[PDB]
Design an enzyme around this catalytic site. Sequence first.
Site, short mmCIF file in Angstrom:
data_model
loop_
_atom_site.label_atom_id
_atom_site.label_comp_id
_atom_site.label_asym_id
_atom_site.label_seq_id
_atom_site.Cartn_x
_atom_site.Cartn_y
_atom_site.Cartn_z
N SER A 125 -15.44 46.32 -11.60
CA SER A 125 -15.53 45.85 -10.28
C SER A 125 -14.50 46.04 -9.35
CB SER A 125 -16.12 44.43 -10.05
OG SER A 125 -17.10 44.37 -10.32
N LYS A 154 -15.30 48.03 -6.42
CA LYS A 154 -15.84 47.53 -5.18
C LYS A 154 -14.81 47.66 -4.14
CE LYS A 154 -19.14 44.44 -7.18
NZ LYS A 154 -18.84 44.77 -8.38
N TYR A 164 -21.52 36.20 -6.18
CA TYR A 164 -20.93 37.53 -6.71
C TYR A 164 -22.00 38.39 -7.14
CZ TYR A 164 -17.68 40.80 -8.59
OH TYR A 164 -16.97 41.77 -9.09
N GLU A 216 -10.26 40.18 -2.37
CA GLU A 216 -10.41 38.76 -2.42
C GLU A 216 -8.48 38.44 -2.09
OE1 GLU A 216 -12.12 37.28 -5.62
OE2 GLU A 216 -13.73 38.68 -5.30
N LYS A 275 -8.08 41.69 -6.89
CA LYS A 275 -9.40 42.22 -7.37
C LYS A 275 -9.46 42.16 -8.97
CE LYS A 275 -14.12 42.39 -7.12
NZ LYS A 275 -14.23 41.83 -8.44
N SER A 308 -14.11 44.50 -14.71
CA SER A 308 -14.29 44.62 -16.36
C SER A 308 -15.59 45.47 -16.39
CB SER A 308 -14.44 43.48 -17.01
OG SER A 308 -13.44 42.16 -16.51
#
Length: 354
Positions: A59, A62, A145, A267, A308, A311
């Site tokens: 991820s 993203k 999420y 984030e 961020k 996995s």
Amino acid sequence: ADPSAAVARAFAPLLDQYDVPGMAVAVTVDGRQHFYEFGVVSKQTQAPVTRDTLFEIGSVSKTFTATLAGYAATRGVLNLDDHPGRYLPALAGTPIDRAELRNLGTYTAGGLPLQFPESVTDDEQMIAYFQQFQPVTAPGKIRQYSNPSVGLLGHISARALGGQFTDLMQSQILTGLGLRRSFVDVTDEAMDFYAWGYDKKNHPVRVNPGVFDAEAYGVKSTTADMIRFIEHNIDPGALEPTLREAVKSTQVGYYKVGPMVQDLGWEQYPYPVALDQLLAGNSGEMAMSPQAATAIAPPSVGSALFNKTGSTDGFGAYAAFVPERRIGIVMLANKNFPIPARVTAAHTVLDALD
Ligand SMILES: [Cl-]
Ligand SMILES: [Cl-]
């Protein structure tokens, strides 16, 4: 300003503690790059991890999808306030069409789940899934999420820009950023560098194909490339203006969700930050359960940390950086081991600088 001793104390014990075959770490401190490798790319070959070993970043992908969406927005081919049906006609008038692209990128679209149901296996089933989806809450109120959520944003970004997501991501974003060893689809040439991942039973695995895999969790990269990406995020000023704004667009905070602020992709946290607040923001509950989200104006002055986690079945990754301090760190590993251990190690190293 030398992170080496802190990296050895924080990262080296992790391999024996979590049975991690191999791991690569890179730290950037005011433009100077430091590389550290541990262990092996494969239990069978025992070849050493290098800064050019390809790992699945999961991820953390993203953040690249957010950058692509930011590239589309800067070009004006899309606006984050648009609705999906402006780009995918089959979704017009459906309940998910109440969401804006910004909600898709911040997991606030209305309760899209963590993963697609197992029955969604192709593009036809993907369209039908979104057409039939009944939101469990109004857009912008709840953060849940979600891979389908950011997946759809990447699909729409590609459609707006008029090409295939994989081709656009590879050419306009990865190559554009100088990440010449980062791939959604690893080439025949680079295949020799791709590590094996190791699942819970220590079997060698790589990420399985799935709907929106490239868009939500499918990038493979190296610490040499990922530290360059982090350096672009620290100071995008050297970038060509389109990519510069695409990178900056990922650093705008849109929601307060308890101890963390949700951007597109990243984030964010204040800096300095207590490790406990970073662990709270990166908790399993944060990733598994609905959390109240409060729309905010973008924070913008002083010191902030962006991070961020990511996995796959066989891999684990973490990236974090502080633009005002010009420090950043990336860890890539070929075992999915607990996020709190990743975050603690990375925070300890960053804290040890100054
Ligand atoms: Cl999924
Ligand atoms: Cl691949």
